[PDB]
């Protein structure tokens, strides 16, 4: 099962959230820079950051040693983190949004018949592997992702094209910063944070992705911001 890759674009993701039945008191906005002057321009509060980044060889090198350290050391993941695995190619755009909404659902307001509300209702007690299979089988989100994949200022690529870019979500749960990447076996704990400094703490994790890959410019960050 192979989906089309979503454009990193607030007008795409905001319309996608509206089709999933989310009320628009939160809206994605672009993040233009990482220095505090630019960040102090993103409306507050911010409850999630989605980061598009390139899957390079240098990435997957840091990636494999990050995993093995956590397997030995055994990090801090509260059971109240909502985490789901990625088992559909090119589904990372939807999984990122779900990770963003699901870990903030009390701040979220849903509308009549909201398909995301129903999915979170049914998946609240599933395992991360069970949630991956549930997404595979959930027609309403698959259909909505597909029409949303055709939106944007660029044309959708062909479904067979290799994609070397990936979405992840950064959120605050129980006083810690979690990176949620469905390609990994668990959430990644990045240290302490709060609702009031999530944006700056999230962007510091973004900074590390970029400094590990210094010749790459293919990055995009959008912030889920009160509207």
């Amino acid at each position: 099962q192979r989906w089309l890759p979503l454009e990193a674009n607030p007008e795409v993701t905001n319309q996608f959230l509206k089709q999933l039945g989310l009320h628009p008191n939160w809206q994605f906005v672009d993040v233009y820079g990482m220095d505090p002057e630019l960040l102090s321009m993103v409306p507050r509060p911010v409850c999630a950051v989605l980061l598009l980044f390139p899957i390079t060889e240098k990435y997957e090198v840091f990636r494999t040693e990050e995993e093995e350290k956590i397997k030995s050391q055994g990090q801090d993941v509260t059971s109240s983190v909502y985490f789901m695995k990625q088992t559909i190619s090119n589904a990372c755009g939807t999984i990122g949004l779900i990770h963003a909404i699901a870990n903030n659902k009390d701040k979220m307001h849903f509308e009549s018949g909201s398909t995301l509300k129903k999915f979170l209702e049914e998946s609240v007690s599933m395992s991360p592997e069970e949630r991956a299979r549930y997404l595979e089988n959930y027609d309403a989100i698959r259909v909505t992702h597909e029409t949303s994949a055709h939106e944007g200022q660029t044309e959708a690529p062909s479904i067979d094209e290799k994609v070397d870019l990936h979405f992840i979500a950064l959120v605050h749960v129980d006083g810690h910063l979690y990176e949620l990447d469905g390609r990994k076996p668990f959430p990644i704990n990045h240290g302490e944070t709060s609702d009031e400094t999530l944006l700056e703490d999230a962007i510091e994790v973004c900074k590390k992705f970029m400094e590990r890959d210094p010749d790459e410019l293919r990055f995009n960050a959008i912030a889920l911001s009160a509207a």
Partner: protein, 76 residues
């Protein structure tokens, strides 16, 4: 005249342009330096997103003005 285009990563691209250059021409100049396809580019000036048909002159973009480049890439 010189203008500066800043990326999210913090890189600054210095470009030689003229007031008559359309936004599309600027995007072409960025492709020539960084190999980013122009349809993936979005340019920002003073918090405001620019449109393909207009010129630097239309936006009163001066020499040594700073633009922001956000990349409309697709993630999978």
């Amino acid at each position: 005249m010189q203008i500066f285009v800043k990326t999210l990563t913090g890189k600054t691209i210095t470009l030689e342009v003229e007031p008559s250059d359309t936004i599309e021409n600027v995007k072409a100049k960025i492709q020539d330096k960084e190999g980013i396809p122009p349809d993936q580019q979005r340019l920002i000036f003073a918090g405001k997103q620019l449109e393909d048909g207009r010129t630097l002159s239309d936006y009163n973009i001066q020499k040594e003005s700073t633009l922001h480049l956000v990349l409309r890439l697709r993630g999978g």
